[PDB]
Paper text:
Most bacteria proliferate through binary fission, which occurs by the ingrowth of the cell membrane and the peptidoglycan (PG) cell wall to form a septum at midcell. [name] belongs to the shape, elongation, division, and sporulation (SEDS) family, which functions in cognate pairs with type B penicillin-binding protein (bPBP) family transpeptidases for PG synthesis. The septal PG synthesis is a key step in cell division. As PG synthesis is the primary antibiotic target, Fts complex holds significant antimicrobial potential.
However, the mechanism by which FtsWI is activated is not fully understood. Here, we determined a cryo-EM structure of FtsWI bound to the regulatory proteins FtsQLB at 3.3 Å and performed mutagenic studies to reveal the molecular details for understanding the mechanism of divisome activation. The [name] complex from [name] was expressed, purified, and visualized by a cryo-electron microscope (cryo-EM). The high-resolution cryo-EM map allowed unambiguous assignments for the [name] complex, except for [name], of which only the C-terminal β ectodomain ([name]β) was resolved. [name] and [name] form a long α-helical coiled-coil at the center of the structure, with its N-terminus associated with the transmembrane (TM) α-helical bundle of [name], and its C-terminus extending into the periplasmic space, where it interacts with [name] and [name] through their ectodomains. [name] contains an N-terminal single TM segment (FtsITM) that interacts with [name] in the TM region and a ‘trophy-like’ C-terminal structure composed of a transpeptidase (TP) domain and a pedestal domain (FtsITP-pedestal), interacting with the FtsBL coiled coil in the periplasm. [name] comprises ten TM α-helices (TM1–TM10) and a large extracellular loop. TM9 inserts into the central pocket with an angle, together with TM4, TM6, and TM10 forming an outward-open cavity. In our structure, the h2 loop of [name] is stabilized by [name]. Moreover, this stabilized h2 loop also positions the putative catalytic residue D275 to interact with conserved residues in the central cavity of [name]. The binding of the regulatory complex FtsQLB induces the allosteric changes in both [name] and [name] to facilitate their activation, including stabilizing the ECL4 loop of [name] and positioning FtsITP to the site of PG synthesis.
Author numbering:
A (entry chain D): 6 to 92
B (entry chain B): 6 to 38, 52 to 490, 502 to 559
C (entry chain E): 172 to 270
D (entry chain A): 1 to 224, 237 to 382
E (entry chain C): 4 to 96
The structure:
Amino acid sequence: PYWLFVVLILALAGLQYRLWVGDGSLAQVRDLQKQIADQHGENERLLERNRILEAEVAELKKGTETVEERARHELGMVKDGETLYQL
Amino acid sequence: FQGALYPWRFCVIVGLLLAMVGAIVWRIVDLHVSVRHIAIPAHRGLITDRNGEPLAVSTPVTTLWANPKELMTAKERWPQLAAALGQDTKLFADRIEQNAEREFIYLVRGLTPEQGEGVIALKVPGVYSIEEFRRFYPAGEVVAHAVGFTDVDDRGREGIELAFDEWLAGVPGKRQVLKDRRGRVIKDVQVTKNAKPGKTLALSIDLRLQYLAHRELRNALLENGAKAGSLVIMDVKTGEILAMTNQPTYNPNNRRNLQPAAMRNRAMIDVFEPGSTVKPFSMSAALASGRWKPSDIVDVYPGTLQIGRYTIRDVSRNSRQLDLTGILIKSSNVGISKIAFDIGAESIYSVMQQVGLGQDTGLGFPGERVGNLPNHRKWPKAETATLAYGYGLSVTAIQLAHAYAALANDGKSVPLSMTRVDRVPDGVQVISPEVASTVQGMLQQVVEAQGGVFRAQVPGYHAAGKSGTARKAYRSLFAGFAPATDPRIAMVVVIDEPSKAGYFGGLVSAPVFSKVMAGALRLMNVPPDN
Amino acid sequence: YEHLPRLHGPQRAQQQVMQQYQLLSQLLRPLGFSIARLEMSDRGGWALTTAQGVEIQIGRDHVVDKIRRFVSIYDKALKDQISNIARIDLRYPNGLAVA
Amino acid sequence: MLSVLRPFPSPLLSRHGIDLDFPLLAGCLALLGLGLVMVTSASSEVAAAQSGNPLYFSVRHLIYLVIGLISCGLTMMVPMATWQRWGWKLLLVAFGLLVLVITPGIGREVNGSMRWIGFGLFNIQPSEIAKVCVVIFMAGYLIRRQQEVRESWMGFFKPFVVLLPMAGLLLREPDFGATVVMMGAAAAMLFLGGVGLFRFGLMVLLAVGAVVLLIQTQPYRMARGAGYQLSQALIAFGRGGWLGMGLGNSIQKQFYLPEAHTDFVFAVLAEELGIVGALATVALFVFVSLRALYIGIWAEQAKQFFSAYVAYGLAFLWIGQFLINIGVNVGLLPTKGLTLPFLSYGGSSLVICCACLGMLLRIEWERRTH
Amino acid sequence: LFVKRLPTGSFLMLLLYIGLLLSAIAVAYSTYWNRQLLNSLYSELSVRDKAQAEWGRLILEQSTWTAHSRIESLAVEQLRMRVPDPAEVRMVA
């Protein structure tokens, strides 16, 4: 008998609530793990993109390939002989 | 307590224990009922055009961090730091004294990393330095008005950076540190909430189209000697804005002592009377309801009508009678006024409202104003002569461009949007498709015919449009859409009074229209139709 | 050794350029050109040279659909008169340059 | 070695099933579980710094808890006549363990005291075995007083033949809290044991004088700006509120309490579970102490006086320890070096506390059935 | 004198208390794990913001080297580029 059963049931329900849902739960642990994985993937993508842009800047400091590519892409120009095909 | 050999002693002991426990309880609940949170700033979102070119990046800068409590222990070092910081010693001293009780103040904001660290290393009177983010606009002057600046706090202040301030300025985080009485962070322990970085924003502007439009408008302003100008390029199908330029444009990152006109967005605050450019909508409404045949002849002679104290005069009155196509070609006003007389002006107001004239724009820009479209239960002759004619109706450049795009979309009024629209919105069919097609072909003819508009012909593309002039001092307006059988881009050109050129739209704005729209269609890969 | 197509590119992108070569060969075999070389500047530009001497230039990003646009343009418009063609540029949003 | 145990009959292996005192067992089990939970919560960060395993102290405390429950069962097997006849040997072994602690060759050094023995994996603190042995010997002396010469002057100093040297040697290494708890247990046992008021006052005043005399020239080891912790622990009670911030969500334990799992467990408990949690724990401690006193009252009713005095001694050990530790965490007292009976992490403290609980349950059973 | 008896639901109460202890230990360890994961995510976001700061610096450095005016001038004057005429360009489909 005793009210200890009621007290233990209430405490167990409250602690299971705080354990499975809410702040500091296992659900938030899974969230944060998913966020860690997503942010790590984003970090790899960003650190590759930064290297690519750094190399592009370095070639800009001495080369003309980037200028040619940008002129072809944005401005739509074309070298001698032309014969531009569009669709 | 009765069972003990000495109940008195047990009672005394229990009472003493309860008294001590009562003292403990009193000190716990009756008396009781460092570590500080510091925010983690969030990386501002990147603004990019519809293709991928960045328009607003968050480059880093090194900002010197000042703790006044440390400077009051090294006051003797104040002149030495002030010499490198480029301020008077008295100014530094009085600023610190005014900020005596404060825990954190700023010395400078945008000092470069390679010299701010040198400044904080050469002199060390407890001064710190942080590498914070500040807005940089690689496009710069071209998109200055569409992509507005941010203040020194790095929040929106004008343009799309305050229109989309919530979307870009991510939610900052919080964390707990060991800060003593002086304020030095002993250790970093726990982050109670991580900072949410800003979400990258993609605009509808085509930076190639924006560059071309800005260059053409700059040439128009320089050779034509006009005071100001505007030019909005739109995609009819998706209803978005492909370009927006205002030649008085400023530099959004080097904002040292900029006049307002330089920072004014002359496409959504500068309102004007559309004049002749609004006639196609009025006559389309006449076609829709009044059963007015496009080939019908209207007696425009003598080209001057008297209505009380109001008089309507045409630019040319040599033609005795003109059809609707002749009315638009000659920019006749008496004919369209008589047509509006023969029809209901309530339908005129409805058709002008449903296309977005002076009602509102979905842009929601901070620096934005709406036009005035008068509404009345009854329409007198003077009111409809000032309403169907753009002589009392006020609209902005963006509203006129949106209306012309809707007219070019076979009457499908697509809502305005600056963000890159991925799927075509349904919109609303303001104009019946056959009436819209007739008006599109007629606006093709007016710029094709030998009338007052011939310079607007796009080389290789059989363009369309109408030229009009405001009087509040003349303002040159020209809106139109280039592709005939399948319009793809509709745009408006607005420029203020030209000092060394005629104020007629077909002479001072039609060449600009043709020049920018030729490249605009070339980079949009639309097949020619001429 | 010389018969095999030589692979060029950044030191740490040597694995990526191999997969790109596999994809390009798979998407280019029906068109008749045989890959002789493939170079990558660290920028991300892709240079393709065939056995017949004609060269294809592809910029960074959107290679997967730029190559498909090249396939379409060649196989329905450019499939004839390839002898004079010695330089092909794909660095356009949708267009193609022939030389 | 198991001949001293009596599995039949016993509070668990009785013919009537299991017949121990449920209120005391429930209170002590609630305290033990709350102690395990609070040790885990407060010791997460503390153990993370020392070893890579966050559950270092929590797993050690769980192992000590299982060992303590086993020890409680073993003690509840043990009859009280064996304690009565073994008191002298227990006193001698407590003396020996404490002296061996004093020796630097086997005792391990701490920041401000040497009150442990290595024993490899598991530590032993004889400062609590000494308290229990003093309680048992004092009960034996109290029952012998009623049978030997009345008010004999030779028997007046008999407690101080043991209480004074043990107090002095427990002060030898800095353990003032344990000495005060042991002396409080002895003095209160005697007050409840029938010692005359004038005689008891003389004993207590001479004991206090002897202790304040012996507190001098006792450094940590001989032959065979610290207020920030308390200041930031007092903040925990205020910031916990009437309803606490929950398990593990404590804050002061992460910066200002490296002893959040040993000494300041009550501050962490009152911050995580709030002022209502602190009041509930205080009520639990008071109920368990008063139950251990009423068990002695009942054993006194059944004319089993040694059991009555042993229960008084154990109840007063618990009273002194928990009162001093709480009044130090709440700031009333300055004696830093003490741990809570059940909630604190202490290894040998938990085993000895469970043995005391078993002894009290044995007293309760024996006062009913033989 | 007499004998006592444990409550009828002794085993059920013991199981409930064991479950309560396990739940409380799990709550404490879950809160600690969440705080550790918050610290790890802060480190990851700091790395991301460092990478984005470097990218912004690289973009600012490229901006002086890349602009419509400069690119057009280099294409025309140096690379001898030309804008194709609408008639010159052969369009497909």
